[PDB]
C-alpha cells in the first residue's frame, strides 16, 4: 500500500539549459557528418540495408537520411528538412543538411558566450535576407529555347551522380520527358512529372538501350491470343468500368415459377453483354483498355469486330494512356462519343521482353505523357538511375519555371559570403558577430568539395577567398575533380537559382528553429 504520489506521471523526463542546446547542435552536426562525404562530382556511394531485406545503394542525401532511423528529435528535424528540400526543388538535399549543421555549429560558439538565442536568430534572419538579395543579384538569365543550354544545365545537375558516365543520354532523356509532360489548359501552365513522366525499370540489357518513349508502356498482354498484337494506327477507347454482368446496388431477388425463366434470364445476361459490346463497337475502335475485368463473352464479341482488349490496367496507367494518345476515359459505353475515341497513337505493339509481355503505345503525335524505359545490370542499379533521372527532371522543370542561374562549384557560396562580410563591415551592434559567422559558415560547401576532391583545404580556401575579394570574381569556384580554382564561365557548372534559394532558406530556418528550442520534455503518452 501507500503508492507514491508525484505531480507529473512516471517515466516523464525533462532536461533544460545549456545541455539541451549542446545536444541539439551535436545531433545536427552528427546528421551532417553522416552524409558529409556524399557531396560533389567525386562523391562515393553508400550501401543501405533496408529493414525489409532490401538494399539501397545510393548517393542521394535524402535517400540515405530517410533510410536511417534516429531517436534524437533534432536528428528527426534534420531528416524532415532534407525531405522538404527534396520535395520542393528536387535536389540540394545533401547541401542543405551540411549548411544547417555548419550554421548550428557556428551558433553554438555564441551560445556559449552569454548571448541570448533571440539575438542570434535576428542576426540569422538579417543574414538570410541579404543572402537572398545577393543570390538574386549574381544570377544570370537563360534562354529556355536553347536546347544546348538546357542540356548543359542538366549535365551540371547530374555530374555528381552515378549516371555521369551516360550523362549525355540521361540529359537528353530528362529534357525530352520534361518537355513532353509540359501542358497548358484553361490558362494554367503545368509540368506534372510525378504523374505523367513514369519511369519503368526492366532489369537486364544495357543502359545505353534505355530511352524515353513517345507514348506509354504497360506490363500487360492481350486478353485472348486471337487478338492482334500489332496495330499500325489504332483508335483507342479507354474505360474504367467492367465489361461484365454484375449485381445491382439495390437488393434484388428473382422468383421463378415457370420453366423458361431461368434460361431466359441467362440469355438476358448474354444479351446485355452483347449490347455493351455493340455500343463499344459502334465507334469503330481498334483497341479497348479498361481498368476492370472483361468477360469471356465480351472478349468474343470484341474479337468478332477485330478489336484488341487489355483487361485490368491501373488508374494511373490509364490516365497516362489518355494523356499520351489523346483519349478520354469513359464509364458508360452507351455514352461513348467520337471525341472520346483516342486517335493520335502511331503504333500499338505488344512485344516480349525476357519472359514477360509488355504493351507499347509509342509513336504518338504530340503526346502529353511518356514512359522512361530503363535497362541495366540489376534492380539496385536501375533504382539509382531512376533517382538520378528524377533529380535531372526536377532540375529541368525548376529551370523551366525560373530561368535564372547561379554559378556552381562553391562560387555562389563565396560570393555571398564576401558580400555579407562587406555589408557587415558597416554594422555597429552586437548582431554583427553572428552575422559574420553565418557569412563565413556559408563557406562549408567549397571546403567540402575540396575535401572530397582530396586537395589541401586551407591553401585552396584561402586562395578562393583572396580571389573573391576582387571585383569581377563572383563566378570563381573550385574544380571538384582536379582540385584547382577555376572560373565557372569556363567549367560551365551552373545551378538553378531556385535550388540555391531553397537550400539557403531551409538551412537558415532550420538553424533558427533549433536555436529557439530549450527544455526538452519526453516520456508522456498521447
Amino acid at each position: 500500500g501507500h503508492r507514491p504520489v508525484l505531480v507529473l506521471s512516471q517515466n516523464t523526463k525533462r532536461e533544460s539549459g545549456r545541455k539541451v542546446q549542446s545536444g541539439n547542435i551535436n545531433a545536427a552536426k552528427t546528421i551532417a557528418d553522416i552524409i558529409r562525404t556524399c557531396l560533389g562530382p567525386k562523391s562515393m556511394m553508400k550501401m543501405l540495408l533496408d529493414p525489409m531485406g532490401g538494399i539501397v545503394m545510393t548517393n542521394d542525401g535524402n535517400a540515405i537520411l530517410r533510410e536511417i532511423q534516429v531517436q534524437h528529435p533534432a536528428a528527426k528535424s534534420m531528416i524532415e528538412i532534407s525531405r522538404t528540400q527534396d520535395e520542393e526543388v528536387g535536389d540540394g538535399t545533401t547541401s542543405v543538411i551540411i549548411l544547417a549543421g555548419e550554421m548550428l555549429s557556428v551558433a553554438e560558439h555564441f551560445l556559449e558566450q552569454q548571448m541570448h538565442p533571440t539575438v542570434v536568430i535576428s542576426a540569422y534572419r538579417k543574414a538570410l535576407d541579404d543572402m537572398i538579395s545577393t543570390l538574386k543579384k549574381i544570377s544570370i538569365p537563360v534562354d529556355i529555347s536553347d536546347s544546348d543550354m538546357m542540356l548543359n544545365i542538366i549535365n551540371s545537375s547530374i555530374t555528381t551522380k552515378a549516371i555521369s558516365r551516360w550523362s549525355s543520354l540521361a540529359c537528353n532523356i530528362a529534357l525530352d520527358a520534361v518537355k513532353m509532360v509540359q501542358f497548358e489548359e484553361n490558362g494554367r501552365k503545368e509540368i506534372d512529372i510525378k504523374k505523367y513522366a513514369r519511369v519503368e525499370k526492366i532489369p537486364g540489357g544495357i543502359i545505353e538501350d534505355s530511352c524515353v518513349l513517345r507514348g506509354v508502356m504497360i506490363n500487360k498482354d492481350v486478353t485472348h491470343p486471337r487478338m492482334r498484337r500489332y496495330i499500325k494506327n489504332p483508335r483507342i477507347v479507354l474505360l474504367d468500368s467492367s465489361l461484365e454482368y454484375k449485381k445491382g446496388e439495390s437488393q434484388t431477388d428473382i422468383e421463378i415459377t415457370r420453366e423458361e425463366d431461368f434460361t431466359r434470364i441467362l440469355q438476358m445476361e448474354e444479351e446485355y453483354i452483347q449490347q455493351l459490346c455493340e455500343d463499344i463497337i459502334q465507334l469503330k475502335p481498334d483497341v479497348v483498355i479498361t481498368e476492370k475485368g472483361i468477360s469471356d463473352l465480351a472478349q468474343h464479341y470484341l474479337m468478332r469486330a477485330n478489336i484488341t482488349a487489355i483487361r485490368r490496367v491501373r488508374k494511373t496507367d490509364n490516365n497516362r494512356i489518355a494523356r499520351a494518345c489523346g483519349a478520354r476515359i469513359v464509364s458508360r459505353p452507351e455514352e461513348l462519343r467520337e471525341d472520346d475515341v483516342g486517335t493520335g497513337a502511331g503504333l500499338l505493339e505488344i512485344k516480349k521482353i525476357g519472359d514477360e509481355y509488355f504493351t507499347f503505345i509509342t509513336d504518338c503525335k504530340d503526346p502529353k505523357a511518356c514512359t522512361i524505359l530503363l535497362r541495366g545490370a540489376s534492380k539496385e542499379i536501375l533504382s539509382e538511375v531512376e533517382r538520378n533521372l528524377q533529380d535531372a527532371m526536377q532540375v529541368c522543370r525548376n529551370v523551366l519555371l525560373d530561368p535564372q542561374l547561379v554559378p556552381g562549384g562553391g562560387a555562389s557560396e563565396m560570393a555571398v559570403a564576401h558580400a555579407l562580410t562587406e555589408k557587415s563591415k558597416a554594422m555597429t551592434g552586437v548582431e554583427q558577430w553572428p552575422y559574420r559567422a553565418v557569412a563565413q559558415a556559408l563557406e562549408v560547401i567549397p571546403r567540402t568539395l575540396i575535401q572530397n576532391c582530396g586537395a589541401s583545404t586551407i591553401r585552396l580556401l584561402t586562395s578562393l577567398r583572396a580571389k573573391h575579394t576582387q571585383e569581377n570574381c563572383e563566378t570563381w569556384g573550385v574544380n571538384g575533380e582536379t582540385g584547382t580554382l577555376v572560373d565557372m564561365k569556363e567549367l560551365g557548372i551552373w545551378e538553378p537559382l531556385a535550388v540555391k534559394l531553397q537550400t539557403y532558406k531551409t538551412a537558415v530556418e532550420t538553424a533558427v528553429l533549433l536555436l529557439r528550442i530549450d527544455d526538452i520534455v519526453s516520456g508522456h503518452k498521447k
Binding site: 552528427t30 557528418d33 540495408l49 529493414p51
Partner: protein, 525 residues
Amino acid sequence: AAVKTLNPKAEVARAQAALAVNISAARGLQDVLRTNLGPKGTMKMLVSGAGDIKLTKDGNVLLHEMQIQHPTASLIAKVATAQDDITGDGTTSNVLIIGELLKQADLYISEGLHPRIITEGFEAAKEKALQFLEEVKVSREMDRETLIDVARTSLRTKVHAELADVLTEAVVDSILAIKKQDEPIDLFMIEIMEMKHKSETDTSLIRGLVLDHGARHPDMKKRVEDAYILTCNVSLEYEKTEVNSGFFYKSAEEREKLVKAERKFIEDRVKKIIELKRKVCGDSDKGFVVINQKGIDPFSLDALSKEGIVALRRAKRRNMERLTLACGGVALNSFDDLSPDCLGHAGLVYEYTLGEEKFTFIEKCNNPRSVTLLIKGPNKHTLTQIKDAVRDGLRAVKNAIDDGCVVPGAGAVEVAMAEALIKHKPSVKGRAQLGVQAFADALLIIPKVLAQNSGFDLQETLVKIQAEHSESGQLVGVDLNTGEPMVAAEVGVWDNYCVKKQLLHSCTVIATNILLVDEIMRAGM
C-alpha cells in the same frame, strides 16, 4: 561512429572495412562457383529445409540455393538473376568475372590507389573490349548445323554427354518448328512437360501438344485416329444466375419440370457441339475432340460421350493459343456462330495413363507452330535438372538465331580481348592504365578456371594459349581434354554474342558501383 552515436543498434562498416567486406563476399561467391564452369565442372547436390534434393550446375540455381545472407551476395545474385532472365546463360561467368574484377582492383587499391582511377580504367577497358567483341564476332547464316553446335555447347556444360546429345537435337528441332521468318520467337509456344516413367535419354520432341489431363468419362475413346479439334473456353457445367434467382414450386411435378428446365441453357450449347460434330463427320472413322478451358459437368460429359466425342476440361490458358497454333483451329469463347472452319485437325489423339495421372497426346499435326518437349526421367531431381538444361539450350539457340553473329568459346575471346586491352593500354592517359590492366587480368579468369576444372595448371596453360594466340593471331581457346590451345571456331565451341556483351556491361557496372561504396549501414530499426 556517427550512425552508431545516433542509433546505438546500428551496424556500420566504413571505408577500407566496407571495401574489405564487399571483396571478401565476392571472393567467397567466386570460390564456390569456380567449380561450376565448363563441361568438366563438378555437380552440386542441394537439400532444402523440407529435404527436397536438387542436382544442379547453374550459377543462378546454385546462387539461389546457397544459404547466404550477405548484402554483396544479394547484389551479385540480383545481377545474375537479370542475366539469366534476359540472356539465359552466363551466370557462372558473371559471378566469376565480378569476383576477379574486384580482386584485381583490390590488388592496386591495397597499394594506396584510389578506387576512382580503377573505375575509370574499367570504363575505358570496357569500351575497348566492346569494340573488340564487335570486331571478332562471326556473322554466319544460322543453319541447322550451327544451331546444333550452339545447343551442344550449352547442354554439354549442363548435363552428361549422351543426354546433352539427345537434348541438342530435341531443342534445335523444337526451336526450328516454331520459328517464323523474320519474326521474333515466342518461347511460350514450346511446352515443357515432365513424365516420370522412363530413362533420361527417352526425352524427345512431340510435334504437337501433350496435356497433363485426360477424359473424365470412362466411356470416352482412349485413342482417336483422325480427330477434329475444338478449342473452346465456354462453360459446359451448371452456372447459377447472377441475381439470386431461386425456384418456387407448389408440387412435385412442378419441381420435376423445373429440374428438367434448369439445365436447358447448358444443353443448348452441348446440342450445338453435337450438331457440329454430326455435320463435320457422319462416319465413325473421323473423331471429335473437345478441349475446354472451363469445366464440364457429368451430365454434359455423358451427353457428349454418347455421341462419341472426347472431351477435356480445365485446360491451361496458354494451351488455347498452343492448340490454335498447332492444330490450326480457332479458340472460341462462345458457340454463337461455330462452323467447320473453326475446327483444328490432329492426325492422332490418344491418352496415356501413368500411375494416378493421365496424359493426352495430340500428334501428327499438319504443320504445328507450337510443339512440346516431353521430359522423361526416373527421379524428380533428374527432371528438374533436364528442365533447367533445356531452358538454357532454348535460350542459347534463340539468342543465336536473333543476331546472326556468334562468338568463339573456350575462353578464346577472353584471351584475345585481354591481349587487345594490353595493346591499347599505353593509349590511356593517366593512372587508368592500372585499371585497364586489372580489367584484362579479370577477363583472363575464364580460361584459367576452365583449365583448372579440366585438371591442368592455370599458369602454364594460360601462357601457352596466350603465346599461341600472339604468334598466329587466331582465336585459340582451351582444349579441356589435352590442355593444348585449340581453335574454338573450327572445333565448334560457340558462345552467344549477346551473352558476352551482357557479361561485359553488367560485370563492369556492378564492379564499378561496388568499388565506390565506402560504407554499409543498417540503421532502419
